[PDB]
Symmetry: C3
Subunit: 336 residues, 3 copies
């Protein structure tokens, strides 16, 4: 399209919501190509990531870790207004894996505190894609401080399975998984700092071990459990988008499956089916589609079970409905 043709396209302002929820959208596109507009203020803030009061100096797109899911359709334009407030201490930017050119946008969005920028790109490829901060020379530090999220570029005709039959979800959730590298002192206690820059040297040493101290969903241990469990009902079709900007993960729904899984995250690559545990490499997003068949509590984990149950990578689903004894029954309950 020409500059004039794009200027004539309809504009739609989207209001982002905090993960794991996803802003309102249509699966099948409602009309022709649009310029879909998003705004995000980058907030540098302390976050507490475990029950020992361990702190991270986060880079929080839109005030969350992960940053929110942005949803467009293929051949829409995504126009982001990105704002770095004067209260921040560092330069930041954004690299959309979904975009083409200038290091994903990173080369065009370097904004110091007190500045803002507007980037527009054409979402030419359908899929879920990571986005993340990437300041030259400081890239991994910003990403593992929580400066990452994802977007979903739906096909204009919605999702389909490998034979072209429609796949339509009732619910969608976004799980951002984060590897943290928190320095400790001589007695094994996690260190606290009063400024992001103060922890840099110490953090780089931990990162070089390639061994995260914490691996969490939605910014902290237990962030998606207890009261913040995701919900569904028997019969409901659910899409779980999962991202990891820096490090591999292997998602698994304990008690369920991935009926369809775009493990590469790309919708023109047909989905795998009947999956127990799928694999998303660092620097990517994937998506799984599941129809719940049984009520009760499910745990959704990175199935390196040390990472899930020692380091923090575990979420819950609470599911309502009728139990199915054909699928599963206790013939003899635990007894002497």
């Amino acid at each position: 399209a020409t500059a004039a043709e794009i200027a004539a396209l309809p504009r739609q302002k989207v209001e982002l919501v905090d993960p794991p929820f996803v802003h309102a959208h249509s699966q099948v596109a409602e009309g022709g190509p649009k310029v879909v507009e998003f705004t995000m203020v980058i907030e540098e803030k302390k976050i507490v990531i475990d029950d020992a009061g361990t702190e991270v100096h986060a880079m929080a797109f839109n005030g969350t870790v992960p940053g929110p899911l942005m949803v467009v359709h293929q051949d829409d334009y995504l126009e982001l207004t990105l704002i770095n407030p004067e209260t921040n201490t560092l330069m930041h930017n954004i690299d959309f894996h979904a975009a083409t050119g200038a290091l994903g946008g990173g080369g065009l969005t370097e904004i110091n505190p007190g500045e803002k920028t507007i980037l527009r790109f054409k979402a030419t490829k359908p899929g879920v894609f990571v986005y993340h901060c990437a300041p030259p020379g400081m890239v991994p530090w910003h990403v593992v401080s929580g400066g990452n999220g994802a977007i979903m570029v739906l096909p204009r005709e919605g999702l389909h399975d490998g034979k072209g039959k429609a796949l339509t979800y009732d619910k969608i959730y976004y799980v951002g998984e984060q590897d943290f590298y928190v320095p400790r002192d001589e007695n094994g206690k996690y260190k606290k700092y009063e400024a992001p820059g103060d922890a840099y040297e110490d953090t780089v040493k931990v990162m070089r071990t390639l061994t995260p101290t914490h691996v969490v969903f939605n910014g902290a241990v237990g962030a998606l459990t207890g009261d913040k469990a995701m919900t569904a009902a028997v019969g409901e079709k659910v899409l779980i988008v999962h991202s990891q900007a820096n490090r591999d993960t292997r998602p698994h729904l304990i008690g369920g499956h991935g009926d369809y899984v775009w493990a590469t995250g790309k919708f023109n690559t047909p989905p795998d089916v009947d999956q127990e545990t799928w694999f998303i490499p660092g620097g990517a997003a994937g998506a799984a589609f599941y129809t719940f068949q049984q009520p009760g509590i499910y745990a959704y984990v990175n199935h390196n079970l040390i990472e899930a149950f020692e380091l923090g990578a575990a979420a819950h689903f609470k599911v309502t409905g009728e139990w199915n004894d054909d699928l599963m029954t206790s013939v003899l309950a635990p007894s002497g």
Copy 2:
């Protein structure tokens, strides 16, 4: 189906055999749906995992690490009697990744020492699948203590390639790969403990490094070598099922290939072909099909070669038959 319909189905009791062998079965299902009955006693037992005499207090389903391969067909019911004898010290249970509901059966099979339970589930999805112990609060410890195995749910019509041609194996082996995390003293020598619980805190610290001390097939360094090498002949068709309940692996047949590989382990997902090295994520099983073409020794390995040759993840195949000079020949043997 209804409870009455299921009660009318024929039962068959299966005697399990120790890995890497697999109990007698038919590739193409005999008749209609059955309730296939297995019994497994859990044994907490000391095992020796290397040639120095390093020992682990294992949780051994049916007395082995890994637990044995159970084989059924799609839409059969798997009915497991699981027994925790009173000589054991801990509660155990079982999570079938093949099953749907109650955390894979885990929520319905918590048995203290002196107790037993019978769980039945419908095997609705075809593939190979991990099973493992998963007691709330103690999940990874039980799994990395060897409390895991796999099942195979064959399609009722046996295996096929991605395009409808039958794939019929002459023999099958099950390779269970185990990451162990054995505490060490100040001399770098592995510690021994009197009971399972005594090793807990020390073991958890090693687990947090995400760096196993040992990575082994069939419970020990060298377990599938020497006179315990797997065997085949030129022309023979072999399926190798490979599981890893906690941690990634990358199987490779040195001198061979995976002609067809269900790397996700799921038979409705078409197999990759002509593979050098395939990839199975932690928490999953995979399967590879190969027709041997050359005689001699092969090594089957996790192709992180440090993991294979330093940590223990190497097995051998001994293959009988005639050398094929068309496929490979030494034009000039090593000479001055």
Copy 3:
């Protein structure tokens, strides 16, 4: 038959150093051939970072990685492998592309002062790792740089999942190397007189499963600056990537993998529109991209710690006209 193999033509090919690739055609020119290559193994001290860090490398043909060899399906690859008397160690070669004798390793064990000639039929199309594998010291040789890859093209060239031609304008081979360099108690990397002197110290580092360096073409920054790879807008590029010992996850920053044979095998249909692909330790993969935008790109292992702290980052410098439809700065950074 026997007479027929003996009657097949023999063609010698001159190798070139990575990331460049020797002369070849995408569609096979003629019928099956015996393609002959020669490689001398060089044990040499190489410098892998900006602080003068040394490794005693095993360098097939004098490079880390060893060079890319390119044949077509059902050609034979006939390698002459030479281990000069100035070397201290036995070496050999295992072609993942080959069938039999541990990939050739059982037939190619050459002491210093010896050579050997191995021939194998390239029956399976794809990119494949090769590496040294002396029994009992396999990982040491591989993580000392003793590895490369080959490409076995389909006789009819590359195709997408639907059967239409994919023809590249150029090809690069990126070999990625995990190194495990011992450090003294002060945190400084150690140097050794001879390869064997480092064995014990190196195996201890290997057992951490934590590389001190992860690099492309044998050193930090080997494919950056004046050594960046090049392309132009409109050009179709194939990037072959190998890792003989450890997982990697390639990503073209600012681009994509339009078609990616992530397993490296051409009979397995390529994934499409990839952001970041995955190649397991012990394999090669291949990505095809058509460049749409000019400028500098970084090509990385997208564990960004591995890329930017440990060394796994390369550059492409791309010429041509910018496309404001695909991307534009509506408002540049401003107060």
